[model samples]
Target chain A: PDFTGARERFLAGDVTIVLLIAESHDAPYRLANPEDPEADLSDEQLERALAAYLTLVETLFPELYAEMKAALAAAKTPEEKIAVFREYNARFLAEFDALIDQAFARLKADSLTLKIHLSQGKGSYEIIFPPEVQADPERAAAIEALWKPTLDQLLAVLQEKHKGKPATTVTYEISAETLRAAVAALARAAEAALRRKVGSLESSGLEVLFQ
Target chain B: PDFTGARERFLAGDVTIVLLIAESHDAPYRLANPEDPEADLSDEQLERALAAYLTLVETLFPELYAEMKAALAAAKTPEEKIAVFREYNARFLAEFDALIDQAFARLKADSLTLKIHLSQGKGSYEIIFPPEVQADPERAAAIEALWKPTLDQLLAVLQEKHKGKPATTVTYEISAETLRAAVAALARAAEAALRRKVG
Candidate 1:
């Protein structure tokens, strides 16, 4: 599937996951593995792993989606989302990141929806990502580009857009066409990066084949 | 039911209400009404009045059951609930009291579950307990005893419970056995109080 297609769909505002418990009994699938974790995949492997990781990123987020959506909708221009992102990256992604450790720890018994999982049957554990992604520069760089928004056209809209009001209240709504489009555009760009990392042929869409 | 019995039950905890709109269209029953709210009624009337009020009290509380239940469970001994009430009494009772005004406003056209409805279809809307019970000392005193935790056995419990811990962090919880007993006991006391109140 094309990167352009997958990302545009994400920015349109989506929250969900696709669980693929491949029968790699000896190679139990794990989003984050605690023991015997692997370094970022070799370039090609990185994209595939990232494609899987991106799906995890979308569904398991605690409140980042709504938070980002609200922040973006509140902004009159594309720049707002970017500004919001830079200023509050953790506020943006920390919860999701923090939960990763917990998900990794639990890969043994049960699981968080998309975060991590170990099939009931033991022994077969596939690749485990090193706890810290930054350890190896090339691989780390590959993983960083996985779901990183600013690393793509997502940055442009964040740089672009007309300055809209920032939504601060706990429950704000978002339905502006431009903001929606920008979010979708950035989503496309990031998805494409993953696709670029993974490249054509073997690569599937971001989530359920993005139109 | 004695006031002591009812009061202790209340100290246990209770909240909520569900008033069915009967054909009181002309009778127009209301729990909260002003001017000419009843003075001591005959024994029979008092019992009947309380029976209805107790039911309503059980249904529509903002927080008494929750506040009391939470306090009790969080505490090792009974005193914890009492002290919490004393410190957070305003938080506990005020919401209920404030809603009294809103309930009163509705009595003319409709009513909350536990109010008295007189069949006087004439221009006789005699008893509307003024929104603020404090307005009239006697009625206020009667309604004050209605489900007030500080009244009977609850009063002693509040006074007796070691001024130990005042649990106040925010969130709270409850269980069936505990909550049920509190509501029943309190219902009895308020009914008794209204009876004793009317008697």
Candidate 2:
């Protein structure tokens, strides 16, 4: 991993991430937006990132953000907070994982797998994939094959749907390192937001600290 | 209009309905188990109904039941119950509605839609349901045209899925009235189950 020009590339190039910081962070239903933020993150990027950066994340995980924050706020104690955490964890991440799997399955079913089999080589090939594909050489190759023609219309639709009603144009490529980094960054952000939900107490003679 | 022969016909007809008795009187998943018996209810021949039905609903609306039950139980006052009610309402019925839409949409996208569009009047015409066809006379006729041949393999697969696994083999016909009746039945079922969450 070369770091000399990464920051300039990260910002100036064709990649951006949105971290959810708003109460309304529960959009996009079930895509893995917050799971990895599409890619590229740094502690500094998060710490210095303006509220605007969160706009994108807000669009991505609108319901999820609302779920997490509201759930924690509704929780009266640390034990209940864990309940809140687990309830929302599956709702957002796991649900989106299912969605991503479905998306891959869609590409695999008619367009990719059947074509590949009917092409030069032959065997049962499935396009169903875990959210992670950057590490899997075979899936990476298959994904490339599927998207080789590229999805140009997606950008057009995004610009159209998002321009006034407002959302950003998003495109994604897979890399586990980048994804984990993004996840860690989001977890850190959520930690702050979530801890606030746990609330603080200094009024009584006894003090209970929440994490 | 004619209740005279409805029972006999209902008993000896190619029809079955799966009524979920869980919460909406609806349920948690799409599994075949009835939490109910595979037996007669009324006009429809639900006789020998497999007293059943979970995992499917479990997978679809994972937190719905848990949220509903716990929240309702936790409600200590009318005010608190309202909080619990809203919490589970969004989670259960609304969430399950999304699942139902997804399930019906999947069929619409290809398996049923494309096939119906391309099918001969001779073969499977069922791909033509407007998510609900019996209501739309055009769609109803189209549905009638489809199942005129009837779906056999589907039953086997459904039976395989539901049988022994504590589920039921649901059969439905596209009656403009009955489809809605079924929807209402489930709605009422869910209404009852959902009402408990409210309390």
Candidate 3:
């Protein structure tokens, strides 16, 4: 339940992690970004992104993350650990998620409308980027090194699938129903990634994902 | 911080009471409809409708309404009314607002798409009769009796305002931010008409 150690680990390290937070089923949307000065993530995209981010967090920070998970799991129980986890998770996650969502929103608004559209259920492309891409300049540079090529690969898939249609011109008319489903899918992906990463860290006996 | 009596009054008969459940310059948007049902009202519209509905309820049920209002006003202590109002408003205004929004959405979807755009952004109109309208044939007939004449008057006003423009096609676009503002205006007009009739 105590995330003091986990938070300390994040604070002490130079690593900047992006934690995605989202609403549960039938809940309203929220975004999680931190780098951008002008926050611009739409409620729908924020919901999708947070789901993805939480998946990553849970996979990477299993024991600590699970404490909060268990707290939520044990909402009716008298266990103080559960209570502490709930409180810490609410405070930390809300703040952290807001920061990340703001950053991502700004980046999306400034970078490309297509990227913004894709994130908001107007287009397609999965596994957008890693947290380090935004968190660390060196890592961002490394990822940017691969971005043009990766983007090209993604575009190629779209082009071949669409029979020479420009991906941008292809208006993906998403209904409200489809958008909610996409947000759910993104959340599941993020949770899966978090579990995988956290398991890896546990196997390595590393105190943290970084540092 | 109790309004059990006020609720009882509403259920009994007095329908001239009013209550202001919650008021704030900024309130986080909450969905009135679930994702699956696909709510038609935008966030702004939902909020406005809720406020209007609360106002209408307050106006309809006065003595019990006054009791409820007094209870809310008495919560000056830090530990007093915040939690109580939250619970009371959530149960009463919030739930009813949601129901009204859902009903409005369904009504819009099923009714005729009147191409008369009243406001600028995303302006469209639709209409549907309530169950009560259909259940009481006499009331339904009465409303229908007024519909055409009222609509004709509205159309005439538009024609006079845009004299020399094509009569068949017109686009009246005005931006007041939210649909609720427009609906609120309509409600005001309706209230005025009722006042005149009663007086």
Write down the TM-score of every candidate: 0.24, 0.26, 0.21
TM-score of chain B of each: 0.27, 0.33, 0.32
Interface C-alpha RMSD per candidate, 1 decimal = 27.5, 10.8, 18.3
Residue A99 of model 1, lDDT score? 42
Candidate 3's residue-wise lDDT over A32-96, tens digit each? 43232124444444444545445434643566567667665555433443345436545544544
Best-fitting candidate, measured by DockQ? 2
Each candidate's lDDT (Cα)?
0.33, 0.36, 0.37
**On a 0 to 100 scale, what is the lDDT of residue B106 in model 3?**
22
lDDT of 3 at A24: 21
Lowest lDDT 10-residue stretch of candidate 3 chain B? B14-23
Residue A149 lDDT (model 3): 39
Q: Supply DockQ values for each candidate.
A: 0.01, 0.01, 0.01
Docking quality of model 1: it rates as incorrect
Candidate maximizing lDDT: 3
CA deviation > 4 Å runs, candidate 3:
A1-51, A55-180, A194-211, B1-106, B109-199
Writing each residue's lDDT as its tens digit, candidate 1 over A1-211 gives 1233332323332211112201111111332432222342244443444344334334445255566557655755344545654444444244433443343332211111112212222211112233222222443354344424322332222222213434211111212322223223323333333434333343445665665
- Model 3 lDDT per residue over B38-148, tens place: 234444544544454445445434554566568767766644554544455445543333433333322222222123434322323222345555566675454444334
Give the DockQ-based CAPRI class for model 3: incorrect
TM-score of 2: 0.26
Backbone clashes in model 2: 31
